C-alpha cells in the first residue's frame, strides 16, 4: 500500500484526470464464474 502522503502527491500532479483509487488486490485468483 503506498503511503498516504504519496497518494495525495499524485492527486495534485494529475488533478482533473484521475481514476477511482484501487485497494489491495484479491489475495488469490477469484474462481472464474460459471
Amino acid at each position: 500500500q503506498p503511503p498516504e502522503r504519496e497518494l495525495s502527491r499524485l492527486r495534485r500532479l494529475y488533478q482533473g484526470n484521475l481514476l477511482e483509487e484501487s485497494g489491495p488486490p484479491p489475495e488469490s485468483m477469484p474462481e472464474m464464474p460459471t
Binding site: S22, P25, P26, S28, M29, P30, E31, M32, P33
Partner: protein
C-alpha cells in the same frame, strides 16, 4: 541496407503461416526488418500448445548472456519470456496485469452473486 545509427536488440522474429505463428528468438540490429538480416539466432518460441499442452520455448542461455553483456537491448515480449523462465525477474507489467485481472474477476463474481440474489428475489416473488 547500410544502416547508420541503432543498436543490437534481442527480439522475436515472426515465422510460420496464417493462423500458425512461430517465433525465432534472434539478436539483430534494431533498424533491420523484423524477419530480415539478423546477427545470431538465440532460440525459438512456439506459442501454440502442442499435443502435450506445452508451449515450447528454447533459449540459448550462453549466447543470450553474451549479447546482454555487449549492450543488446531486449524487446518487451522477450523480457516476459525471460521472466516466466526464471532467468530474469518478473516484469513489472506482468505483475500489474495479473493484479488487474484479479480485480476484474472479483467484480464479475460479485455481480453473479448479486444477480443470483436478484434471482433469489424473483424466487421469493414466485
Amino acid at each position: 541496407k547500410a544502416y547508420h545509427g541503432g543498436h543490437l536488440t534481442i527480439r522475436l522474429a515472426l515465422g510460420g503461416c496464417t493462423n500458425r505463428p512461430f517465433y525465432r528468438i534472434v539478436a539483430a540490429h534494431n533498424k533491420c526488418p523484423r524477419d530480415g538480416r539478423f546477427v545470431e539466432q538465440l532460440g525459438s518460441y512456439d506459442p501454440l500448445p502442442n499435443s502435450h499442452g506445452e508451449k515450447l520455448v528454447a533459449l540459448n542461455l550462453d549466447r543470450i548472456r553474451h549479447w546482454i553483456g555487449c549492450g543488446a537491448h531486449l524487446s518487451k515480449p522477450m523480457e516476459k519470456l525471460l521472466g516466466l523462465s526464471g532467468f530474469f525477474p518478473l516484469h513489472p507489467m506482468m505483475i500489474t496485469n495479473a493484479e488487474r485481472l484479479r480485480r476484474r474477476r472479483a467484480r464479475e463474481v460479485l455481480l453473479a452473486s448479486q444477480k443470483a440474489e436478484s434471482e433469489a428475489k424473483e424466487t421469493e416473488a414466485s
